[PDB]
Design a protein around this ligand. Structure first.
Ligand SMILES: O=P(O)(O)O[C@@H]1[C@@H](OP(=O)(O)O)[C@H](OP(=O)(O)O)[C@H](O)[C@H](OP(=O)(O)O)[C@H]1OP(=O)(O)O
Ligand SMILES: [Zn+2]
Length: 404
């Protein structure tokens, strides 16, 4: 009922996103076996919702009346996301109380396993009294190999609201553009080989092409687990070396019944057939496409919502003419889309339901489950920051192409 200082040694580091630090259970307790703990970070860059936020989520009252951030996230997933993606692939998590000492203790424990830049940006928020418990989907429900993909955005904007100068956002994906800016900022060592347009394309061959690329340059988009311990990918991690490639190949023996050296290609095909067969990407894409207008459109609607004069227009007379009702719907939908754009997918495998994949070369049958994880509510205030960042992306790409 309250996790204490002594309980902190039963949880081991699993990884983290921007918002959360995730630990896995390594103790004996039947309440916690096969679970992970999600803990919110105190951003040194940054009560539950702002005034303008409360007006935006007005429609869903259980949300606006959340005692704390944990409950907020749980309810966001439960009442907004689940109705849209379905309960089969989404899990909302359960509240648990935690002591300041537990948090303080956990934070100290995992410091030397965290990337230094992550430490530099944020620590655990020791002021929270709560945390979230979720099923660990790197366990199935024998051996279990599991694969985490963070697909990002898989479509091109179409909007009337993209500026004349910015038209390259129409041909070239956001992830591809951002890659270039990230490189410039020493955030990544080399450009990723991944193109989400392939992953979401609905073409089987392009799906396998995306998986091969994800294997190649995982960065923060690909991870593989054997029974919970990480065996590929990182934070963002560098290109897959022969060293990496061999360690992974070895870790796969037994699970993939193929000749030494041919296990990897089998595995990648296995992942591809699962993603594609499950059609789980199509439904995520429909939620992504709730960004109907692109940030270059939506931004105008935001300034109406907060009741400020629009700086983006200077000294369209079309979005500012919409009813306030409609303006909220649009911005609301923009923020949901942002959730779907930044979540990840976990596909769990175990040897053999109508849910399975066949390995043509080996004759094995693998069962699989797919779950959407890392689904965060996005603060409304970020609408201003989305526009700035988008602008920085596109201006830098145009500048790279200006150097023909
Ligand atoms: O903005 P993006 O698309 O770069 O995504 C951010 C992510 O950067 P990425 O490009 O995936 O490396 C970013 O991931 P990293 O911090 O790079 O691991 C976060 O996931 C961030 O969301 P939040 O702050 O955790 O709510 C993400 O921010 P939101 O855009 O989802 O607010
Ligand atoms: Zn405007």
């Amino acid at each position: 009922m309250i996790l204490e200082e002594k309980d902190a040694s039963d949880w081991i580091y699993r990884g983290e996103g921007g918002a959360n630090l995730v630990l896995a259970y390594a103790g004996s307790s039947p309440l916690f076996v096969g679970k992970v703990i999600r803990i919110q970070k105190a951003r040194r860059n940054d009560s539950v919702l702002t005034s303008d936020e409360q007006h935006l989520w007005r429609e869903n009252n259980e949300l606006i009346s959340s005692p704390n951030k944990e409950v907020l996230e749980q309810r966001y997933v439960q009442n907004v996301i689940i109705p849209l993606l379905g309960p089969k692939h989404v899990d909302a998590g359960v509240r648990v109380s935690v002591s300041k000492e537990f948090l303080e203790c956990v934070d100290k424990k995992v410091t030397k396993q965290r990337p230094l830049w992550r430490v530099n940006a944020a620590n655990v928020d020791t002021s929270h009294d709560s945390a979230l418990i979720l099923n660990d989907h790197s366990l199935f429900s024998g051996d279990c190999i599991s694969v985490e993909i963070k697909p990002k955005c898989g479509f091109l904007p179409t909007s009337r609201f993209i500026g004349k100068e910015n038209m390259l956002k129409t041909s070239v994906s956001r992830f591809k553009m951002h890659q270039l800016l990230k490189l410039e900022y020493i955030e990544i060592s080399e450009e990723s080989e991944y193109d989400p347009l392939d992953l979401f394309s609905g073409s089987k061959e392009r799906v396998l092409e995306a998986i091969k690329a994800l294997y190649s340059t995982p960065q923060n988009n690909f991870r593989v687990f054997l029974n919970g311990s990480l065996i590929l990918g990182g934070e963002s991690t560098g290109r897959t070396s022969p060293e990496i490639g061999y360690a992974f190949e070895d870790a796969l023996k037994g699970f993939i019944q193929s000749e030494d050296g041919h296990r990897t290609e089998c595995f990648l095909q296995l992942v591809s057939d699962a993603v594609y067969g499950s059609g789980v990407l199509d439904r995520l894409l429909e939620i992504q496409k709730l960004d109907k207008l692109d940030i270059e459109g939506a931004i105008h609607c935001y300034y109406d919502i907060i009741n400020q004069p629009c700086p983006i227009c200077k000294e369209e007379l079309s979005l500012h003419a919409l009813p306030l009702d409609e303006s909220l719907k649009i911005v609301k939908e923009y923020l949901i889309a942002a959730t779907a754009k930044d979540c990840s997918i976990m596909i769990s495998f175990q040897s053999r339901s109508g849910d399975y994949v066949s390995l043509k070369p080996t004759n094995q049958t693998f069962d699989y489950k797919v779950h959407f994880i890392d689904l965060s509510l996005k603060p409304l205030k970020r609408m201003e920051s989305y526009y700035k960042l988008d602008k920085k992306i596109i201006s830098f790409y145009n500048r790279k192409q200006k150097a023909e």
